[PDB]
């Protein structure tokens, strides 16, 4: 029933449709791993033809023997790992697709704009107005634009490929969903998000498994080593509790554990005492390292998110002024007040700002996925 994590995390209805479809089409965990691998593979196809999470997971897996890959991957953390891996790749592939639809759209609008600007010139050039080298270079920008269009068309096909793979044979690939530029800031996160949520991370579940294996009292380990705080403030920002866990201007981790109740027994003393202890030490040191990194990941994502939100906000502002400036330029033109070329030039500034905004929105999306992943599967 872990559907609660992605259903309440991802806001976009289309992407939730796709995620739901892929889960249905990927009942077998080992197969889901193949499909993700291959969906990832045919992007690297752009290099060899002429996310930290997936790296670690796939890296972990191949460094394993086949018997081990099968023992693991029957454990709970591995199914959680594969759920998250699947969800995040479907969502990423969709954003890649929608990104490409959108860049392609702008690129074609830019082309038409360059062709109008060009056609205009050559009528005037035959009345003595421009350089032949100007006319020359206007031809070049059109040809390079034609280039990007085919390039964007390839990126579109790459992502559609990845999508069909994750989705299976009977999955409807989305049309271009048109973008309203005034709704691109990310969505609010629940306030006072409890750090307990991080216990659902595969890497921390695996760490607690290693603790239980060295016979730790898990309750006692958590109380000793796991900061029980809130992750978010009243807004969707890092809480002060979260921030204070890192030294100012060093990022060094602050938490100093105190063990009130012994985590390991004296156990079954007799023989191999020292070795059992070493394993106890190791599972603990590993628990610690995973925790501080989990918390660092969440903090880094929250910070990246606030930064991209501010950048997007600024681009939206430039865009609104460029839109109003274009309309005014169009009216002036109609009154003989400005040349046609000034109108096209203004439109081009709109186009470039739209493209920047698209890039940032996408980087925001990549970061949401990061957050979803750093939370260990959403915030429920």
Curated annotation (Swiss-Prot):
It comes from Escherichia coli (strain K12). The cus system plays an important role in copper tolerance under anaerobic growth and, under extreme copper stress, in aerobic growth. Transmembrane segments: none annotated. Keywords: Cell outer membrane, Ion transport, Lipoprotein, Membrane, Palmitate, Porin, Signal, Transmembrane, Transmembrane beta strand, Transport. Forms pores that allow passive diffusion of cations across the outer membrane. Part of a cation efflux system that mediates resistance to copper and silver. In pathogenic strains it allows the bacteria to invade brain microvascular endothelial cells (BMEC) thus allowing it to cross the blood-brain barrier and cause neonatal meningitis. PROSITE patterns: PROKAR_LIPOPROTEIN. Gene3D superfamilies: Outer membrane efflux proteins (OEP) (2.20.200.10). This is Cation efflux system protein CusC.
């Amino acid at each position: 029933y872990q559907n609660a994590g992605w259903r309440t995390f991802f806001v976009d209805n289309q992407v939730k449709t796709l995620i739901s479809e892929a889960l249905v089409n990927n009942r077998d965990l080992r197969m889901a791993t193949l499909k993700v691998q291959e969906a990832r593979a045919q992007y690297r196809l752009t290099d060899a033809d002429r996310a930290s999470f997936d790296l670690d997971f796939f890296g972990r897996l191949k460094n394993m023997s086949e018997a081990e890959r099968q023992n693991y991957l029957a454990t709970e953390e591995a199914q959680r790992a594969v759920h998250i891996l699947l969800v995040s790749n479907v969502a990423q592939s969709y954003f890649n697709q929608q990104l490409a639809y959108a860049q392609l759209q702008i690129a074609e609008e830019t082309l038409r704009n360059y062709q109008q600007s060009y056609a205009f010139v050559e009528k005037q050039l035959l009345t003595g107005s421009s350089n032949v080298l100007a006319l020359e270079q206007a031809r070049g920008v059109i040809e390079s634009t034609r280039s990007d269009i085919a390039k964007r068309q390839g990126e579109l096909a790459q992502a559609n490929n990845a999508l069909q793979l994750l989705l299976g044979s009977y999955g409807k690939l989305p049309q271009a969903q048109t973008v309203n530029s005034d709704s691109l800031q990310s969505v609010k996160l629940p306030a006072g998000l409890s750090s307990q949520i991080l216990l659902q991370r595969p890497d921390i579940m695996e760490a607690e498994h290693a603790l239980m294996a060295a016979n730790a009292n898990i309750g006692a380990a958590r109380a000793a080593f796991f900061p029980s705080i809130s992750l978010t403030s009243g807004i969707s920002t890092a809480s002060s509790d979260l921030s204070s866990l890192f030294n100012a201007s060093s990022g060094m981790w602050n938490f100093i554990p105190k063990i009130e109740i012994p985590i390991f027994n004296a156990g079954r003393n007799q023989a191999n005492l020292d070795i059992a202890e070493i394993r106890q030490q190791q599972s603990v040191v590993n628990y610690e390292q995973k925790i501080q990194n989990a918390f660092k990941e969440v903090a880094d994502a929250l910070a990246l998110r606030q930064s991209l939100n501010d950048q997007i906000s600024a681009q939206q502002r430039y865009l609104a002024s460029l839109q109003i400036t274009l309309q005014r330029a169009r009216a002036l033109y109609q009154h003989g007040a400005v040349s046609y070329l000034e109108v096209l030039d203004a439109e081009r500034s709109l186009f470039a700002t739209r493209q920047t905004l698209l890039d940032l929105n996408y980087a925001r999306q990549v970061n949401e996925i990061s957050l979803y992943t750093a939370l260990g599967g959403g915030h429920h």
